[PDB]
Each structure stands twice: as structure tokens, then as C-alpha cells.
Amino acid sequence: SHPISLKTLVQEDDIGVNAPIIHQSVIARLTAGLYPLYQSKKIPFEPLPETMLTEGYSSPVPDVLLYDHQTEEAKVIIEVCQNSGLKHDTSKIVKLIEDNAYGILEGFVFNYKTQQWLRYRLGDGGVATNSSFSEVLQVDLNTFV
């Protein structure tokens, strides 16, 4: 199990200067947790951290994405809040999914301070819900953090 829980890291971050470390730790946790499912062929998409969707200056760069090498598209994206709001950042992922540019089917936002998750699925009319379950991957993403 994790040598240091997210709860402990958050409890110890009195001045808030550890936020970047905690954020990258979540990225590490998700990437490391998902990777063996990919290598074992349980999931078809490669987990990739901090990967640009395009070469544009303004390209989105999701904290974690699930990449389909065959179609050259990200199918699931995960954003970890960092000194930012869960709700705010979710309104952002919804637009990314509903504008249909990138082939993204599902998105998540995780607030590491409260360990709360929001999910959005393409086709859900712009309304997000409180879920950590990926229907694309068939896994509970909260299990990895």
C-alpha cells in the first residue's frame, strides 16, 4: 500500500508549498496503477501523464490520459485539481468532451484534498456526476490513489 496516504500528505501541508508534490504524486499513482492493466491487455489504451492532445500552442494537456495508439486519440482523461476548484475544472473537461475534437469519451476530475471525484460521459447533456468509475476502462479509479 501507499507509503504515505493522500490524507496524510494533505494534513502535513500546512503552508501549502507541498501542493505540486502531492499533485504529481497523484499523477504517479494513477499512471502506475493503470499501467499493469495495459501491459496485461486488460485495457487497450496506454496511460500517459501530462500529454499534449495536439501540437497547438493552446493544446490541452490532461494530467493523465488513456491513449488509443491505433486511432491517435485520447479516450479517457483525468484532471487532478491543484490550487483550483473541483467544479470549475469539471466545467472545463465537459467542454473538451462535448466539442468532439479529440475523441474523448469520458473525463474525471479529482480533488486530492477531499479525495472527491466528478465524472463526465460524452452524451450526458453536459451534466457531471459524483463517480470515480470508468465505464470505458471498467475500473474504479479511486482504487489507485
Footprint of a copy of itself (CB under 8 A): 1-4, 17, 20-21, 24-25, 27-29, 31-32, 35-36, 38-41, 46-52, 55, 67, 69
Q: Where are the beta strands (DSSP E) in the chain?
A: 46-49, 64-68, 73-80, 106-111, 116-121, 133-134, 139-140
Burial of 10 (0-12, 13-18, 19+ CB in 10 A): middle
Query: Residue from 22, 25, 30, 63 that binds Na ion (CB under 5 A)?
Result: 63
Residue found under cell 493523465: 64
Pick one of a copy of itself, Na ion, none as the site partner of residue 46 (Cβ within 5 to 8 A by kind): a copy of itself
Pick one of Na ion, a copy of itself, none as the site partner of residue 63 (Cβ within 5 to 8 A by kind): Na ion
**Footprint of Na ion on this chain (CB under 5 A)?**
63, 80
